[PDB]
Amino acid sequence: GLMQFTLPVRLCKEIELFHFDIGPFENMWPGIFVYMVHRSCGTSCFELEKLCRFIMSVKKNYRRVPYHNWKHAVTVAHCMYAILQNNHTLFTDLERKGLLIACLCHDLDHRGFSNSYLQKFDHPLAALYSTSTMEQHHFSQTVSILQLEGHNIFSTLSSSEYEQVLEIIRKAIIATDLALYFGNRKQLEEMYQTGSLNLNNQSHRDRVIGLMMTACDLCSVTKLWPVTKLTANDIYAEFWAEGDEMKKLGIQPIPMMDRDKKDEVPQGQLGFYNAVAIPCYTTLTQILPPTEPLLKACRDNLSQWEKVIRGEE
């Protein structure tokens, strides 16, 4: 109860900012997370011994892939933390609890492959879940770890609250399926502009949490340029590995994933910023004005990629 986590002055200050980078020291990430959970929810909301055990089990169940790894997990959790801290009064006690957990677990057991690769490979998980295949697997993994002994960090919740919070987590994790983003943002836009968006409508909160999850998930595009630029190497390293596996199944992969088409990455990023990222953070800013820094930072990077194409780097 009286064991407050603290951080070095630079991290103490720089962690409250959206563009924070959690650094190269793996061993500090658990403490960074607990710090955020405390500041974002309360010193009280989780039992420290249970939390740490949960944190470490979740870490053990991320894999050593170039991008969809433990560092991504914590990065995504941090973006959410920022959003929650800049929208203090908008969210319930359970929402602040479940969402940070949802983000930590959102890519549990990821192997670096898209849902499509599993379909075409005919992976057994694809049999079990036709849509949002990895995301239903990520949620399922979260439930496993939650049921290990000494791991129920929600043990003080009533039966009801427990079910609510696990439903927050489930919907939140499903929403990281980007195929579902496009519709979700379309609807939030029309609801916002036609004035009908309404945060007492649970059906509407669900959608809004979905968009926050897309925002947090994509948040490497909202970092300072050198962090964004370097993360890109990792994202594309998984892509090209998948392309390879596609070619192995006798299927020319889309150029995004073809490592013989490395030269098209800059134009590919442009496309993605215009087609995906900029819309995401625009709409999110409209719904949640204080998240504007994500939009700004995203635009800055879009400009930086334009500069790559023009040979200015």
Residues that bind ligand 67A (CB under 6 A): 178, 218, 220-221, 235, 269, 272, 276
Residue 275 DSSP one-character state: I
- Least Å from the CB of residue 62 to ligand 67A: 15
Q: Are 21 and 76 within 8 A, CB to CB?
A: no
Q: Are 168 and 102 within 8 A, CB to CB?
A: yes
- Least Å from the CB of residue 135 to Mg ion: 6
The reply to whether 151 sits in an annotated binding site is: no
Q: Are 233 and 259 within 8 A, CB to CB?
A: no
Neighbours of 12 (CB within 10 A): 11
* Total residue length of the chain: 313
Return the sign of the alpha-carbon dihedral for residues 172, 178, 179, 180.
positive
The reply to whether 72 sits in an annotated binding site is: yes
Q: Which does 234 bind (CB under 5 to 8 A by kind): ligand 67A, Mg ion, Zn ion, none?
A: none
- Least Å from the CB of residue 277 to ligand 67A: 7
Binding residue (CB under 5 A) for Mg ion from 107, 234, 238, 242: 107
The question of whether 88 is a catalytic residue gets the answer: no
Q: Return the number of the residue (172 or 208) whose C-beta is nearest Zn ion.
A: 172
Closest of 189, 170, 181, 239 to residue 214, by C-alpha: 181
> Which is the catalytic residue, given 19, 38, 68, 78?
68
238 binds Zn ion (CB under 5 A): no
Question: Which residues, 6 or more positions from 153, have their beta carbon under 8 angstroms from its beta carbon?
Answer: 46, 47, 50, 51, 54, 101, 146
Size of the site for Zn ion (CB under 5 A): 2
Looking at 8-16, 175-183, 188-196, 272-280, which segment touches Mg ion (CB under 5 A)?
A: 175-183
Torsion angle (degrees, nearest 10) of CA 199, 201, 206, 212: -10
- Least Å from the CB of residue 106 to Mg ion: 6
**What's the alpha-carbon Rg for the chain, to the nearest Å?**
19
21 binds Zn ion (CB under 5 A): no
Q: Are 153 and 47 within 8 A, CB to CB?
A: yes
Query: Annotated binding site: which residue ranges?
Result: 68, 72, 106-107, 217, 269
Question: In the complex, which residues of this chain contact Mg ion (CB under 5 A)?
Answer: 107, 176
Query: Annotated binding site for 3',5'-cyclic AMP: which residue ranges?
Result: 68, 269
Query: Annotated binding site for 3',5'-cyclic GMP: which residue ranges?
Result: 68, 269
Which are the catalytic amino acids? Answer: 68
